[PDB]
Amino acid sequence: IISLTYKKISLRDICLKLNLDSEQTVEYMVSRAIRDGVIEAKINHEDGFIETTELLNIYDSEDPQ
Amino acid sequence: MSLQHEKVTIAPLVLLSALDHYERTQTKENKRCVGVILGDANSSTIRVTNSFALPFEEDEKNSDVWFLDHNYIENMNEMCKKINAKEKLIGWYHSGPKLRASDLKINELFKKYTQNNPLLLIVDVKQQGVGLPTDAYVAIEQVKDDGTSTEKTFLHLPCTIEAEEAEEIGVEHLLRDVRDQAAGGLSIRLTNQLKSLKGLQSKLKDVVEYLDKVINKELPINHTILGKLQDVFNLLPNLGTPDDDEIDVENHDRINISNNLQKALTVKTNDELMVIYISNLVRSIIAFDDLIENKIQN
């Protein structure tokens, strides 16, 4: 829900949103989830926020074929 | 004379005549039959309408030695014009197999009679392959950059076939084949795509072994051949062009329409599914009653 609503969000904000305990914990949920491609995101450690990466225009791609 | 010889369109009647006359003048085993070809010119497109045999006796030993009765050609010609006076002498058929540089001299004889450069229409009678058995050549005298003090030569000309209305209907009445140059249904054209690849391959292979001979076996450096190959490499396709991206857009369009149409046929046949089942339900009752009727009959 959080990824769709907000494309770029500080990891701090998610913790408050899902009531989750600390910064390290949310690190660990997103990290397991994006292996399965549910969220489909990548964490940017350096910048201290998370980037949605599904950004459509898969028409141009070979995909509809 | 006439430079105008840009294209050669050829009557199937000409072919037919050249093949038949070959045997009724009774020449075999590389004994040439030379006959006249009649039709129009002083026109870009040259149209060879019809032909007639001349007697031709050719000495076996050499191609510099031959008999041709000149006088005959004039006597034949005048009766022939009465029939149709549109037609003019424009050159000569040669009954193959294949070009000679003795023809250059032969051509010159015919040029006396003709007011245009004589066309040498080599109608090959051996019909090798299913490809056209016509090469066309015209005697032209041209200068050349090498040093040569004017060369006299035969230059290849494009051969195609056209037939008249009268002629075309004769071709189709004769034929009884299923045909496969029709390029009609999915099946004929399926073949046709493969056929073209291999078509190309054979030709390409010939180019390739020919290039080896030029720089190894001292076949002359014919600058014209090489010159033409440059256009092939320059105008060769490229990838990562925004054209390539363009092809992909088209590819999606055509597959897209294919699917809608595929589903659309599924609907039609399913309506038929229902119709056969109504019929079948009806006939269960008829089958039942059938027995009762037979009881009375027995």
From Swiss-Prot, chain A:
Post-translational modification: N-acetylated by NAT1.
Modified residues (Phosphoserine): S61
Family: Belongs to the proteasome subunit S3 family.
Binding partners and assembly: The 26S proteasome is composed of a core protease, known as the 20S proteasome, capped at one or both ends by the 19S regulatory complex (RC). The RC is composed of at least 18 different subunits in two subcomplexes, the base and the lid, which form the portions proximal and distal to the 20S proteolytic core, respectively.
Note: Present with 16700 molecules/cell in log phase SD medium.
Biological role stated in the UniProt entry: Acts as a regulatory subunit of the 26S proteasome which is involved in the ATP-dependent degradation of ubiquitinated proteins.
Record protein name field: 26S proteasome regulatory subunit RPN3
Range covered out of full length: 394 to 458 of 523
Curated annotation (Swiss-Prot), chain B:
Organism: Saccharomyces cerevisiae (strain ATCC 204508 / S288c) (Baker's yeast)
Entry keyword set: Acetylation, Phosphoprotein, Proteasome
Record-level Gene Ontology MF annotations: metallopeptidase activity
Modified residue annotations for N-acetylserine: S2
Function summary: Acts as a regulatory subunit of the 26S proteasome which is involved in the ATP-dependent degradation of ubiquitinated proteins.
Domain MPN, residue spans: 8-143
Domain of life of the organism encoding this protein: Eukaryota
CDD domains documented for this protein: MPN_RPN7_8
GO biological process, one term: ubiquitin-dependent protein catabolic process
Other known facts: Present with 19800 molecules/cell in log phase SD medium.
Post-translational modification as stated in the protein's UniProt record: N-acetylated by NAT1.
Listed PROSITE patterns: MPN (PS50249)
Family, per entry: Belongs to the peptidase M67A family.
Record protein name field: 26S proteasome regulatory subunit RPN8
InterPro entries xrefs: EIF3F/CSN6-like_C, JAMM/MPN+_dom, MPN, MPN_RPN7_8
GO cellular component, one term: proteasome complex
Gene: RPN8
Lineage per the UniProt record: Eukaryota, Fungi, Dikarya, Ascomycota, Saccharomycotina
